[PDB]
Amino acid sequence: SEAILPIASSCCTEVSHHISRRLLERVNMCRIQRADGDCDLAAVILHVKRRRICVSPHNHTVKQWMKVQAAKKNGKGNVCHRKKHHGKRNSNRAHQGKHETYGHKTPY
């Protein structure tokens, strides 16, 4: 444990931004950190047995993960969002899984 870069701090001043579920599924604790009067950055604090990873709440994979994790009846500790959307406008089976198009600014 080093104090040059304080690991012993409840907040997440840094994030990994984008993350995969194989890590997320290992998460036991989730907290939504908000820029308001808590800490100066909006982050998802994720506690894993080996490390505490901090990710961006804007991450699509996280929102997918949280729905799977929300299904836990034991308790919901590693879960923050219980819903990815209010619903989902999805397709049956002919889809991309996530048709995330980087909206091109100025089509001309």
Short mmCIF file of C-alpha atoms in Angstrom, two decimals:
data_model
loop_
_atom_site.label_atom_id
_atom_site.label_comp_id
_atom_site.label_asym_id
_atom_site.label_seq_id
_atom_site.Cartn_x
_atom_site.Cartn_y
_atom_site.Cartn_z
CA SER A 1 0.00 0.00 0.00
CA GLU A 2 1.50 3.27 -1.14
CA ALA A 3 0.41 6.71 -0.08
CA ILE A 4 1.94 8.62 -3.02
CA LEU A 5 -1.09 7.55 -4.98
CA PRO A 6 -3.63 7.11 -2.15
CA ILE A 7 -5.31 3.77 -2.62
CA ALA A 8 -6.81 4.09 0.81
CA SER A 9 -9.59 6.45 -0.15
CA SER A 10 -13.25 5.60 -0.52
CA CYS A 11 -13.49 7.40 -3.84
CA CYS A 12 -12.59 6.67 -7.41
CA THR A 13 -10.61 9.55 -8.91
CA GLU A 14 -9.73 7.42 -11.89
CA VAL A 15 -11.65 4.96 -13.99
CA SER A 16 -10.97 2.28 -16.56
CA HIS A 17 -13.90 3.69 -18.61
CA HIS A 18 -14.70 0.67 -20.75
CA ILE A 19 -14.81 -2.77 -19.20
CA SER A 20 -15.74 -6.38 -20.00
CA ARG A 21 -18.19 -8.56 -18.05
CA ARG A 22 -15.69 -11.32 -17.24
CA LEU A 23 -14.18 -8.86 -14.77
CA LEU A 24 -17.53 -7.38 -13.79
CA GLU A 25 -18.98 -10.74 -12.89
CA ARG A 26 -16.20 -10.97 -10.30
CA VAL A 27 -17.38 -7.72 -8.67
CA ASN A 28 -18.88 -8.01 -5.14
CA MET A 29 -19.43 -4.30 -4.39
CA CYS A 30 -20.76 -1.51 -6.53
CA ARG A 31 -21.18 2.11 -5.64
CA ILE A 32 -22.19 5.04 -7.79
CA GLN A 33 -19.97 7.96 -7.10
CA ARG A 34 -21.44 11.23 -8.14
CA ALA A 35 -20.05 14.66 -8.70
CA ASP A 36 -22.26 16.66 -6.40
CA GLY A 37 -20.92 16.56 -2.94
CA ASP A 38 -19.24 13.25 -2.66
CA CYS A 39 -16.29 13.15 -4.96
CA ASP A 40 -15.25 15.26 -7.94
CA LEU A 41 -15.94 12.62 -10.58
CA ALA A 42 -18.80 10.32 -11.52
CA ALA A 43 -17.58 6.78 -11.27
CA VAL A 44 -18.62 3.30 -10.52
CA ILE A 45 -16.63 1.88 -7.67
CA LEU A 46 -16.41 -1.90 -8.11
CA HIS A 47 -14.91 -4.11 -5.47
CA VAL A 48 -13.43 -7.34 -6.56
CA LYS A 49 -11.61 -9.82 -4.29
CA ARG A 50 -8.26 -8.94 -5.90
CA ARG A 51 -8.77 -5.17 -6.58
CA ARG A 52 -11.23 -2.32 -6.59
CA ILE A 53 -11.84 -1.24 -10.14
CA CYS A 54 -13.45 2.00 -11.02
CA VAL A 55 -15.41 2.34 -14.26
CA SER A 56 -17.49 4.85 -16.08
CA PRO A 57 -21.32 4.77 -15.41
CA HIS A 58 -21.71 5.57 -19.10
CA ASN A 59 -20.40 2.15 -20.03
CA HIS A 60 -22.82 0.00 -22.02
CA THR A 61 -21.29 -3.26 -20.81
CA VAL A 62 -21.71 -2.18 -17.18
CA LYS A 63 -25.41 -1.52 -17.75
CA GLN A 64 -25.71 -4.97 -19.36
CA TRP A 65 -23.82 -6.52 -16.45
CA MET A 66 -25.91 -4.81 -13.80
CA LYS A 67 -29.10 -6.40 -15.14
CA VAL A 68 -27.57 -9.86 -14.86
CA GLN A 69 -26.20 -9.06 -11.45
CA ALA A 70 -29.46 -7.53 -10.31
CA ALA A 71 -31.02 -11.00 -10.56
CA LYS A 72 -29.22 -11.87 -7.29
CA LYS A 73 -31.70 -12.72 -4.57
CA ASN A 74 -28.98 -13.00 -1.90
CA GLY A 75 -28.55 -9.32 -1.90
CA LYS A 76 -27.75 -6.63 -4.34
CA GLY A 77 -24.36 -5.30 -3.43
CA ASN A 78 -22.47 -5.39 -6.64
CA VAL A 79 -25.42 -3.93 -8.31
CA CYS A 80 -26.15 -0.26 -8.82
CA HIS A 81 -28.37 0.20 -11.83
CA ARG A 82 -31.17 -2.27 -11.85
CA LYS A 83 -32.20 -1.29 -15.30
CA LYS A 84 -30.13 -0.55 -18.41
CA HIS A 85 -32.98 1.39 -19.94
CA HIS A 86 -36.58 1.79 -18.81
CA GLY A 87 -37.21 -1.05 -21.19
CA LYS A 88 -35.42 -1.81 -24.43
CA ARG A 89 -36.34 -1.51 -28.04
CA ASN A 90 -34.75 -4.70 -29.20
CA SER A 91 -34.92 -6.91 -32.17
CA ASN A 92 -35.80 -10.61 -32.07
CA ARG A 93 -32.57 -12.29 -33.17
CA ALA A 94 -31.47 -10.30 -36.17
CA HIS A 95 -29.37 -7.59 -34.58
CA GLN A 96 -25.84 -6.49 -33.68
CA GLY A 97 -26.22 -6.75 -29.91
CA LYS A 98 -25.46 -3.09 -29.72
CA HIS A 99 -25.77 -0.94 -32.80
CA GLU A 100 -23.62 1.84 -31.45
CA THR A 101 -23.00 4.23 -34.22
CA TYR A 102 -20.60 7.04 -33.55
CA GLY A 103 -22.86 9.86 -34.62
CA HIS A 104 -21.06 11.78 -37.26
CA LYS A 105 -21.22 15.45 -36.68
CA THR A 106 -21.84 17.45 -39.84
CA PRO A 107 -22.94 14.95 -42.59
CA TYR A 108 -21.80 17.59 -45.04
#
